[PDB]
Amino acid sequence: SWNDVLQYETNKVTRIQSTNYGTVKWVLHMIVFSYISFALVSDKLYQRKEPVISSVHTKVKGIAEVTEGHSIFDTADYTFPLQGNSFFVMTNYVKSEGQVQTLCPEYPRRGAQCSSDRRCKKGWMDPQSKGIQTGRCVPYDKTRKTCEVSAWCPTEEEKEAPRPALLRSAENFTVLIKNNIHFPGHNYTTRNILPTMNGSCTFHKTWDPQCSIFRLGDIFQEAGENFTEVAVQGGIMGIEIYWDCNLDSWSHHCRPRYSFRRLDDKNTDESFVPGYNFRYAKYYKENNVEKRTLIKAFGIRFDILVFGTGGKFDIIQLVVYIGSTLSYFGLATVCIDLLINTYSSAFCRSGVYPYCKCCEPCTVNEYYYRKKCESIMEPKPTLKYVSFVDEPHIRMVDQQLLGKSLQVVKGQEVPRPSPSWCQCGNCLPSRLPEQRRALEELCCRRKPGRCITTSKLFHKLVLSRDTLQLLLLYQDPLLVLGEEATNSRLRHRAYRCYATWRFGSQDMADFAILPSCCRWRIRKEFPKTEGQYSGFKYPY
Amino acid sequence: SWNDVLQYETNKVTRIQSTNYGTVKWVLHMIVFSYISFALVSDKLYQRKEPVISSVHTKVKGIAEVTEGHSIFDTADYTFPLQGNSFFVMTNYVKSEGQVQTLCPEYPRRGAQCSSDRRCKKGWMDPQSKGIQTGRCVPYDKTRKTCEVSAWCPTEEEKEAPRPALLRSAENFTVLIKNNIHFPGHNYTTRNILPTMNGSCTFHKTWDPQCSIFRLGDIFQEAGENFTEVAVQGGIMGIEIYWDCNLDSWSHHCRPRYSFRRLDDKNTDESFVPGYNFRYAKYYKENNVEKRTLIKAFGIRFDILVFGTGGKFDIIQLVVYIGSTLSYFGLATVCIDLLINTYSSAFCRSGVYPYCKCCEPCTVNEYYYRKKCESIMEPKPTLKYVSFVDEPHIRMVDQQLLGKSLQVVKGQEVPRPSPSWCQCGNCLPSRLPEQRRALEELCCRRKPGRCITTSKLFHKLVLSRDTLQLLLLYQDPLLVLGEEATNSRLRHRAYRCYATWRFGSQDMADFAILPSCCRWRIRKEFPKTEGQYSGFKYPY
Amino acid sequence: SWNDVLQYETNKVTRIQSTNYGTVKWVLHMIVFSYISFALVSDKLYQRKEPVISSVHTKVKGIAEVTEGHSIFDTADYTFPLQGNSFFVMTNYVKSEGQVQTLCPEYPRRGAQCSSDRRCKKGWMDPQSKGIQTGRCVPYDKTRKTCEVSAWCPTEEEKEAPRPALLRSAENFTVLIKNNIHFPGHNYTTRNILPTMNGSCTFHKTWDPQCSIFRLGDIFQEAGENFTEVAVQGGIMGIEIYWDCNLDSWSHHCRPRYSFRRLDDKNTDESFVPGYNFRYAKYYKENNVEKRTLIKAFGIRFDILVFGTGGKFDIIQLVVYIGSTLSYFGLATVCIDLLINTYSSAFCRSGVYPYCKCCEPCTVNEYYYRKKCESIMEPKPTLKYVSFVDEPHIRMVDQQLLGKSLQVVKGQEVPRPSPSWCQCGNCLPSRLPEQRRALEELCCRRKPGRCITTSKLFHKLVLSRDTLQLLLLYQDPLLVLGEEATNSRLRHRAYRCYATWRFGSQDMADFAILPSCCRWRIRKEFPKTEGQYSGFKYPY
Ligand SMILES: Nc1nc2c(ncn2[C@@H]2O[C@H](COP(=O)(O)OP(=O)(O)O)[C@@H](O)[C@H]2O)c(=O)[nH]1
Ligand SMILES: Nc1nc2c(ncn2[C@@H]2O[C@H](COP(=O)(O)OP(=O)(O)O)[C@@H](O)[C@H]2O)c(=O)[nH]1
Ligand SMILES: Nc1nc2c(ncn2[C@@H]2O[C@H](COP(=O)(O)OP(=O)(O)O)[C@@H](O)[C@H]2O)c(=O)[nH]1
Ligand SMILES: *C(=O)CCCCCCCCCCCCCCC
Ligand SMILES: *C(=O)CCCCCCCCCCCCCCC
Ligand SMILES: *C(=O)CCCCCCCCCCCCCCC
Ligand SMILES: *[C@@H]1O[C@H](CO)[C@@H](O)[C@H](O)[C@H]1NC(C)=O
Ligand SMILES: *[C@@H]1O[C@H](CO)[C@@H](O)[C@H](O)[C@H]1NC(C)=O
Ligand SMILES: *[C@@H]1O[C@H](CO)[C@@H](O)[C@H](O)[C@H]1NC(C)=O
Ligand SMILES: *[C@@H]1O[C@H](CO)[C@@H](O)[C@H](O)[C@H]1NC(C)=O
Ligand SMILES: *[C@@H]1O[C@H](CO)[C@@H](O)[C@H](O)[C@H]1NC(C)=O
Ligand SMILES: *[C@@H]1O[C@H](CO)[C@@H](O)[C@H](O)[C@H]1NC(C)=O
Ligand code: NA
Ligand SMILES: [Zn+2]
Ligand SMILES: [Zn+2]
Ligand SMILES: [Zn+2]
Ligand SMILES: [Zn+2]
Ligand SMILES: [Zn+2]
Ligand SMILES: [Zn+2]
C-alpha cells in the first residue's frame, strides 16, 4: 500500500466573484489579526516569564535626642543588626528599670484590686498580668491592695505610650536601600542603584524616582499616613519594589518602581493591640543580683517587599500562542457560510423581505447555496421514491408500508432535480407474495386521468427496442445473447429508462418505484418466459 | 487585481440526511463542549492569576514558671523582638554562667582525656571543643586530666537537654497572627482578621477555623506532633496560611486556610544535631572583668509560610483558552469521516460482514464515499489508459514501455466510470519511429475474437462523417475549411469519440491509447494526404 | 425540525494519486509532530508547575582566635540566634568601649575642627557625626579643637576596618544547611539531606555535590571571590538552592542544586558604604552609670535563596497544549494548496518556465486546480453575458449600459465552459421602451459577415418545432395546451436552446443575452399574437 499512503486529498471549493463577501472576509481577517497581534505584544505572550530572586540590604541614618536629662539615640539605639527585608525604627518607648525576680504585689488594674485572700487564687495566670499569683493579697500602696505574684518586680505599670512620641524626630531619618535582583532562568542580574546615583539624592516620586534613599516621613506621606500620629503606638510600613523587567535586547529595561503602603491595620480592635510594639530586656548584674531593665519599644517596622517578573523571548511560547490563535481565522468562513446557509431559505422571501427590502439583494445566497451544498438521503432499505404524472413534485416514502398500498401512503415532497388504487385504468394487481404486494400497488397518477404509458415519449424513451439495444451495445459493443438473456437486459434497461426520465438523478432513480401500469407495460414488451419477476430490490 | 483579492472561497459539501451521523456528530459536540466548559470553570482558566504578597505580624502571649529557686519567663524572656514570618519560643535550656576568656582544662569528653603532653597539640581545633589547645595536659579534676585550651572558662559541659522540658508550659501559650496580603496586579488588599473576630476566640479546625489565635499545643496536635516530647530538644513548626482568592465580583472570596506541618526532621542523624537550639551569651562586667553567661536555648521555631494566588477574570486569558480548544470541535468530523472512508472498503464485505452481521447496514458508507471523494491520477508523461473490448476493466500503464508492445505490458486494473500482438486480424504495424513504436502496438482485444471496428456502433459513434461534422459545427456554427483542414478536424474528433465511448471520463480519455485497428480505420476514413501522423501526444 | 438537526455535512474532496504531494504532505506532518512532541517533552508542557515552599535551618561551626591579649570567638560571639534564610559571620571589627551619654568634643574629621564658636551651630546634626552640636568649640586635644556634641562619649573614631581581618580564620568555618521544601498543590515534601549523608562530608562541586556542609572559603572560591579580601569590609554572599523537581512516578527526581553568587556590589560608590557592617552596643552599668561598648562589626551576610518548581502530570494541561498545536497540522494542506493555486497560473508558462525548465513538470497543477476549484460569478442585476459567433471567448458586461448599445459595450473576456450596430444584416431594432433598448441592441457577430441564424444548426438546435415539443413533453409527458400557451413555451424553450448552445453552462446561460437576429428569428417562428414581448428578465 505504498501508493495508498502517498496520496494528497484537497477540498473541492467554490470561488465566488463577490466583492461584498471578499471585503467581509478580509475585514474579519484584519480584526482577528489586529487583536491577535495586540494581545501578543501588550501581554508579551511571546516571552518566558520568571519571578525575581531578591536580596535587600538597608542602612538607616539619623540621630535622635530624647528629652526626659537628655539621652542620645543613634542607629545602635533605635535599630537592630537586621538589615534585610525588614528593619525596625523605634519612635516611642516606656521603660521599667531595676526589675528583680521576686515576689511583689500586682499593679493596680481595672480588676487587680483585692480585699481578701479568697479573691486571689494561687497559681492563677491572669492574661493581663506578667506574673503567677500566690493567693496572697499583699498591699501595693496605702490606698489599695493587689494580689501577690511571682514576677520581675516591680511589675510594669499599665502606662500608655507617650504622646507625642519620644523619637518622633525619626521622621527626618533616611534609609538607603540596596536591592540585588536575579533571574536564574534567564541568568540576568542587576541592582537598583545605578552608577549615576549620588549620595546626596533623596527619593521623590517625580523629581528623583530612582534614588533609593528615602526619608521616613516622606515614605509615610507617599502612603497617605501621618508619621507623627503613627509614631505614638507604632505600625508596619511596606516599601514595595516592583521589577517589571524586559530582557529582550531590542526592548531591554530592568528598573525598579517604588511604592509605599501601610501594612498595619489602623482600625484594629483594641484586644488585638493596634500599632506595633515589643518588649525587650537589658539584663545586668547589680550587688550579685540578676537585674533587668524592661523596655516596651514602639516604632515602625518597615517591610521591603520586592516582587516582579523578568521576561525574555521564547520560541516555544510564541509557537504555542500562535497555534492557540490560528483557529480564530476561521471566523470569516464561519460567518459567511452562515450567511449563505441562512439567506438561502424560503422564509426569507416569505416573511423577511416584504418587511425589509434592504435585504432584497441577498437572494444571491440561494444561488451560492446551490453551488456549495448537495443534499443526499441515507439509502435505507425502506427508502422509496414515488412520482405521479399529475404532480410537480416527487414523494419520498421512507416508512414501512405495513400492508398499505404505496399509492395511499403519502411521503415527504421532494423537488425533481381495474384495481381500486389505480387512477388510470391500465394498472394490474401485483403478482408478488402478499406481504410485499403493497410495494407494487402504485399508479402513475394520483387523480383520475390519462395513463403515462399512453404518452408518445413512453414508447420512445422506455419501450423502443432499438434504443434499448443501442444502449446495451454502448455498454458492450460486441454482445451476443439469447432471447431470454436479451429480454432480461432489455426489461431491466427499460426500468432504468423510466426511472431516469421521471426522477432525473440516479440517486433518486435507484430507489424509484415504477407504477404498476408502466411496470407491466414494460414486462409485456420484454416478457419473462419462465419464472416470476423479482420486482424492486434494495440496491445496497 | 482588485477583483482578484475581493473573492470568497467556500468548501463544497455533501449534506447527508442520516439520523445516525447527525446524532453521533451532536453527541461528540456535547462531549467536547462539556469537557471544555468543565476545564475552564474548575481550573479558572479565564482568570489572570497572581502570587500573593504577604506581611506577617505575630504576638506570643504567656508566662512560664521554671522550677530550679523560681525564675519567671515572660515574652521578653523566651521570645525575641522578631515578629515576622518566624518567631522562636524557648521550651528548654542549659546555662553555664560566669565564663571568662582565659586558660582552662577541657571538659572530660569521650576522648578529651590525656596522660601526656604528647597527646595534646598546640593550636589544635577540636570540632567538639569550644577552645584552641595549647599543647598542655592540665588537670581538670583529681580523677582525670584534659588538654588546656584557650576559651571562655569554664567550658560548657556536655550536658543533655533537661527532660522534661523546663518551659514545657509553653504548650498553653497562644500566638496571635496578623497576615496582611496584597495582589499588586489586581490592586487588592485584605487581611486575615475580620471585624467580627473577638479576642476571646481560639482557633479550632471545625469550630473556629478563621480565628488567628493559636494555642501552641493545639498547633502541635493538628500537625500530629507531641509538644511535650518535641520541647525537650526543640524543633521547627510550620504554620501555613493558604490564600485561594477569587477576585471576581460575582464569585468573590479571599479568606485564608490554616494548616500545620512540622519542618524539623525527627529522623535526623545524630551528627546533624536533631531538634532546634542555639547558643547565645549575656555579656556583663564584674570586678573589671568581661564576663559572659552562655545559654543553650532549646525551643520551637515557628515559620509562618503564607502562599496562595489571586485570580480575576481576564479577557485575553479567555480568548487564548477558547482558541486553544476550538480545534477539538473537529473531532466529530474526523470520526465520522474516518467511518465513511473505512466502511466503504471492499474488505468490509469480504472479511468483516460475514463474521459480524450487525455491521451490515454500514454499507451506506460506500454510497457516502462515492458522493464525497473523487480520485484523480497525476497526469505524468508516461500515463496511459488501455481498454480491451473483451475485458470489463481498464488498464493503466503508468510505466515506460522500453520497447515492449503496449499489448503485453499489463497495468493496474481501473473500473470504467497480421501483427503478432494483434488478436483481431485488423491491426496494422505502427508507422512511428522505432523508439516509439511500442505505444501503437495495441490491439482492441486481449484474447482472439472479433474486432471492435466491426461493431455496428463503431461506424455510428466513431466513423459517421455526418455526426462528426455536426459536432464540428456545434463547436463553430459558421465554419468553412478545406478538405485537408476538414479531414484533420474529423480525424481528431473521431479519436475523441472512440476515447470518450470506451473510457467514459475525459480524465481517462485524455490519456487513452487507441488500438491499432481503430486508429487505422479512423485514418482510412479521414486520411492525411501529405505527411505522417503525429500519433498520441502528452496533453500536458 | 428534528430531521433538520440530525444531519451530517462532509466536505467534498479530490484525492490526488500523486507521490510528490503525498510525500510532501507526510514529511510536513512529521516535522510538525516532531516539534510538537519535542516542545511538550523538553518544556514539560503536560505538567502543572508549582513554586516551592521552603524552610531553611543553618548551623555555623568554628572557633576563632583574635590577636589583640587573646580573645576567643565561638558561635555565640560571631553569629546571631537567627538560623533561617540569612546568617551573619563577623570577620572584622572595631570597638569603642566605655561610652557614656554626656557632652564631649567631636572626633577630628576632615571638617570637624573649629576655631571659634561661630563655626559651631547649636542643634546641628552633622550627617557624619554621632551627636547633636551645642554650639561650643571645646578642645579635643592640645593641637586642635572640635565642636561639642551631645552623644555617647567619647565618640567613635573614624577608624578604618583592620587589615588583615581580625577573624579571617572564618574562612575555615563550616555551615550545615537544612532545607525543607514543600509543594502544597502536589502535596509533596522532601529535604536536602539524604539518609546516606554523613557528618564528615564537605560540599564539592564534582566530588560531593549533595553534601550540605559548606566551608565558607570554599563558598567564596565557587563564587569567584576572595574571602580574605572581602573579610576586611564585609559583603553579602548568596547561597542558591535550586529545586528542579519532577513529581511524576516514572521520572521522579527532587534534588537540590547548589550555586554561589556574591550579592554585594564591590564597585559600590564610597558614599553608599561598600561592604557589609553594622553597629551594635553592649549595654552595662558601672558605678551607677549607664555605659555602653559600641562595636562596628564587619562580616559576611549569607543569604540562602531557595527557589524552584515542582511539576506533575496534569490532564487539563496536556489537553490545552494539544488543542493549541492541532492547527499546525493544517500546514501541509496550506502549503500544497498554495502550490496548486500558484502553479496553475498562466504566467508560469509565460515568464517562469522558459527561464527555469526544472519546474516544467509542475504543469500538473493546472489539472489539479481544474478538479479542485470552480469559479462562479455573483448574480447581480446588471450581469450580462455576450457571445459573438466570430469570437472564441464570451464577454461579461457586468456594468450598466446607460444608453450605450450592448454591441459596443466591451466586457471582460471569459472562456466558454439595417441597424447601425448590426454586422449581419438580419438584426432588427428593439421594440422595448427607450430606456431599456440598449440591452437588445446586440448582433450575433462583432465583425461583418454571415449571420448565425443562417447556420444549419440554428434551425436544428433552436428553431426545430419537433425538438422543442419533444423537450416540452420530456418535462411534462401528458401536456395539453392551446396555441397561445404552446407558442409561449416553445419560444421560451428556444431562448434556452440558443443560450445553452452558445454559452454551455447554465450559470452563464441564465444571464446570456440573445442577439437581435436570433431573438427575432425565434419570435418569428413562435409568434406572440397579442401583447408585447417581455424580453430578458433578471433570474433572481
Ligand atoms: N428502481 C426500480 N427498480 C426496479 C423496479 N422494479 C424492478 N426493478 C429492478 O429490476 C430488476 C429485476 O426485476 P424484475 O425484472 O422484475 O425481475 P426478473 O425478471 O427476475 O429479472 C431488479 O434489479 C430491480 O432493481 C422499480 O419499481 N423501481
Ligand atoms: N487519447 C489519444 N489521442 C490520440 C491517439 N492517437 C492520436 N491522438 C491525438 O490525435 C492528435 C493528432 O494525431 P494524428 O492525427 O495521428 O496526427 P496528425 O495527423 O498530424 O494531426 C493528437 O493531438 C493526439 O493527442 C490515442 O491513441 N489516444
Ligand atoms: N437568457 C436570456 N433570456 C431571455 C432573453 N430574452 C428573453 N429571455 C427570456 O424569455 C422569457 C420571456 O421573454 P419574452 O418571450 O420576450 O416575453 P413574453 O413573450 O411576454 O413571454 C423571460 O423569462 C426571459 O428570461 C435573452 O436575451 N437572454
Ligand atoms: C445579504 O446577506 C448580503 C449582505 C452582504 C454583506 C453581508 C455583511 C454582513 C455583516 C457581517 C457579518 C459577519 C460579521 C459577524 C460579526 C463577527
Ligand atoms: C456503520 O458504520 C454504521 C454505524 C452508525 C453509527 C456509528 C457510531 C460509531 C461509534 C462512534 C464513533 C465515533 C466516536 C469515537 C470516539 C471519540
Ligand atoms: C511543482 O510545483 C512540482 C513540485 C512537487 C514537489 C513540491 C515540493 C515543494 C517544496 C515544499 C513546499 C512546502 C514546504 C514549505 C515550507 C514549510
Ligand atoms: C525635621 O527636620 C526639619 C528641618 O531640619 C525640622 O524643621 C522638623 O522639626 C523636623 N521634624 C521632627 C519631627 O523633628
Ligand atoms: C499628624 O498627627 C499629629 C497628632 O499626633 C497632628 O498634631 C498633626 O497635625 C498631624 N499632621 C498632619 C499633616 O495632619
Ligand atoms: C496547660 O493548662 C492546663 C489548664 O490550665 C493544665 O492542666 C496543664 O497542665 C497545662 N500544661 C502545661 C504543660 O503546663
Ligand atoms: C508526649 O511525650 C511525653 C514524653 O516527653 C509523654 O510522657 C506523653 O505521654 C506524650 N503525650 C502523648 C499524648 O502521647
Ligand atoms: C585554614 O585552615 C588551614 C588548615 O587548617 C590553614 O593552613 C589556614 O591557614 C587556615 N586559614 C585561615 C584564614 O585561618
Ligand atoms: C586574597 O586577598 C588578599 C588581600 O587581602 C591577598 O593577600 C591574597 O593573595 C588574595 N588571595 C588570592 C588567592 O588572590
Ligand atoms: Na486550533
Ligand atoms: Zn393506474
Ligand atoms: Zn398508468
Ligand atoms: Zn488487432
Ligand atoms: Zn481490432
Ligand atoms: Zn446583426
Ligand atoms: Zn445575426
Residue numbers in the entry:
A (entry chain A), B (entry chain B), C (entry chain C): 6 to 73, 84 to 432, 473 to 595
According to the publication:
The P2X7 receptor is an ATP-gated ion channel that activates inflammatory pathways involved in diseases such as cancer, atherosclerosis, and neurodegeneration.
To characterize the molecular differences between key mammalian P2X7R orthologs, we obtained cryo-EM structures of the full-length wild-type mP2X7 (2.5 Å) and hP2X7 (2.5 Å) receptors in the apo closed state conformation. Conserved features include their trimeric architecture, the 310-helices forming a closed gate, a partially hydrated sodium ion present in the closed pore, palmitoylation of residues in the C-cys anchor, and zinc and guanosine nucleotide-binding sites in the cytoplasmic ballast. There are also hydrogen bonds between the hemisuccinate group of the outer CHS molecule and the side chains of N261, H268, and K49 (distances of 2.8 Å, 3.4 Å, and 3.3 Å, respectively). Although all three ortholog reconstructions are of similar resolution (~2.5 Å), there are no densities in either the rP2X7R or the mP2X7R reconstructions to support modeling of CHS molecules, suggesting that these bound CHS molecules are specific to the hP2X7R. However, the identity of three residues within the classical allosteric pocket are different between human, mouse, and rat orthologs as seen in sequence alignments and visualized in their respective structures. Second, F108 in hP2X7Rs correlates to Y108 in both mP2X7Rs and rP2X7Rs. Finally, V312 in hP2X7Rs correlates to A312 in both mP2X7Rs and rP2X7Rs. Residue I214 in hP2X7Rs and rP2X7Rs corresponds to a glycine in mP2X7Rs, introducing flexibility in the mouse ortholog that could explain some pharmacological differences. The larger side chain of V312 in the hP2X7R (A312 in the rP2X7R and the mP2X7R) forces an alternative rotameric conformation of Y295 compared to its conformation in the mP2X7R or the rP2X7R.
